[PDB]
Amino acid sequence: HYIGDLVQRTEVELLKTPNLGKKSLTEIKDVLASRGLSLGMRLENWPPAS
Amino acid sequence: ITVGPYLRLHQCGLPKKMALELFKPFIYGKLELRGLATTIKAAKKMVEREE
């Protein structure tokens, strides 16, 4: 749902998931990179009581 | 070196400016871990400002 949840997902997990090809993963990485973010980050004590 | 009479045998007294300089990558890692900084440059700026 949130950017915080997506950012923690790694590239391999989002490659193995069904209905998500290489183009969609690349577009996700592109829209993340537009804001200086990347997949594979790690966060502690998430979510903060949404 | 000065003297500290209140210390225990396993303890020393370290200035916090020296500690801030010596433990810098640990501070970067802990800052990025808990969401305060999203990138390395943000943590660099935060440590520079001494927030």
Next chain:
Amino acid sequence: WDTIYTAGTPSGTSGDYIDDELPVYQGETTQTLQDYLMWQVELTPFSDTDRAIATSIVDAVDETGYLTVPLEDILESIGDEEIDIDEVEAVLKRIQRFDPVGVAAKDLRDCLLIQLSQFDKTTPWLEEARLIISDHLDLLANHDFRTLMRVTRLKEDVLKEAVNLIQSLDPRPGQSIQTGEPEYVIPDVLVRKHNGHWTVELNSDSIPRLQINQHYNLQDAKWLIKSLESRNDTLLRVSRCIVEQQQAFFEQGEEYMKPMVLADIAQAVEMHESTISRVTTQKYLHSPRGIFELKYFFSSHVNTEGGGEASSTAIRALVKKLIAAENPAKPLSDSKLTSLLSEQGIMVARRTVAKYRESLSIPPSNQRK
């Protein structure tokens, strides 16, 4: 007597150099723009392919922070055929947000848009400046403000605020990382006016300590001793001839330099042309006008209707003077310039005047109004 300095910078050293043995020179490391960029690349959660693409991308960044090859070059340089171009674009987008923001941009419009993408949405004149940069960035370069106003459909004040916001950005983001220190030059021959005429003298910064090690071998160095003397003699003679022939350049600046060549000095000093070409290269003289390389005084010429010759540097200076005082409402075309220099006796062409204008980096007539 040689002039004694009435002021100076006190020497940095404040020690007594007591130790009689000091180690050999090793040097230090420096952090350039690319070192900082790679340091940021390593600490980023990339992949193996992403890190290779980032390495190839950072290899192509220049001193100003602008990408110097098209993305197709990088994709070819990767060397793997499964990789498409969108992955390269994504890695480039991620790199462009490293410190300083806007680095590794394709062109100015891209860099300005990247910098504007980082400001918070509550900045007042954000959409207007974004539209100006994205759509019409050359109308701003022409300082038009009316056709741009006719297209952007905006009033005066909004346009002024948007222009002020645009001009507050950084066009060269990569110059922030200053690894360089301004280096200088040491003049070798100094020219000063004595008895109303200009005379030259060697700089006394060299090492004239003529010594030998008679304690113990020095026969070979005895030849180098007089080799240095020969070098000093030839440099002094060539510089003296150059200054004697150019007595009017120093007095009145440019527009009076004579059209001399290597052969003239070779005949004057009785040496081969090659020796003159070797001495007068990467050697400088200091005058109350500035520091000039000895090669600066050799120039071409054009025919003068009066029967003489006019140096090309004089014609360049005249072109500069004429253009600097042209009509602000309607500037001067090179056809006008060739006419004005024609009446003075300077018989030059028109394309030659255009070449001179290009070398001086002066925009054409239409761009000077």
